[PDB]
Amino acid sequence: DHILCFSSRGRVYSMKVYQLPEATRGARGRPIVNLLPLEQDERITAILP
DNA sequence: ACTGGAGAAAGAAAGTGAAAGGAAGATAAAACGGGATTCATACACCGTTAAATACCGGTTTAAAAATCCCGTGGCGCGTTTTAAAAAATCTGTGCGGGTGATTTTAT
Numbered sequence: 733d734h735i736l737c738f739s740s741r742g743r744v745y746s747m748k749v750y751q752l753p754e755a756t757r758g759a760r761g762r763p764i765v766n767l768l769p770l771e772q773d774e775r776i777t778a779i780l781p
Numbered sequence: 782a783c784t785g786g787a788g789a790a791a792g793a794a795a796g797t798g799a800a801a802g803g804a805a806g807a808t809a810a811a812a813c814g815g816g817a818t819t820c821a822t823a824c825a826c827c828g829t830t831a832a833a834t835a836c837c838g839g840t841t842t843a844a845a846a847a848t849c850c851c852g853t854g855g856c857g858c859g860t861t862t863t864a865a866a867a868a869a870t871c872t873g874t875g876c877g878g879g880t881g882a883t884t885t886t887a888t
Contacts, residue, residue, distance in 0.1 A: 759815070 738778040739770065749781075 737745040745768050753762040764776065 756816085 733781050736780045737768065737776045738780075739774050739776055741771075741774055743774070 733749050735747050735749055737747065739745070747767065751767070755761060764770070768776075
């Protein structure tokens, strides 16, 4: 599926679901800055499949 | 005395070997984060019941919804900039026969 990410400054980004890290129940995850060109204080606040 | 060639002195410009140092790299120790076990222990599922809550009938009333006039700033259009992505153009490289060349040790 496609994913539309809305940031805190009105920006929009597109990304496939299977490009996200896959982990287990006890893991933590990976920072999202490595996947999208965000700024120093820009956060994702909405997702639309 | 005078002339013109030649050798030697003297002076100025260019090449040189050595120079801190600093950004630019490079290499180890450390702190970190993600799997295999091991249970005791707290959590999931099953019968019982007092109690707390949902629901119906009829008011009401104060609050929110609806309506009209108007005056603006927030979108819309047309025309420029400006990064960003794409297409086009150069740069190396190795295959196998040919031409010609380099270096270090012992006695």
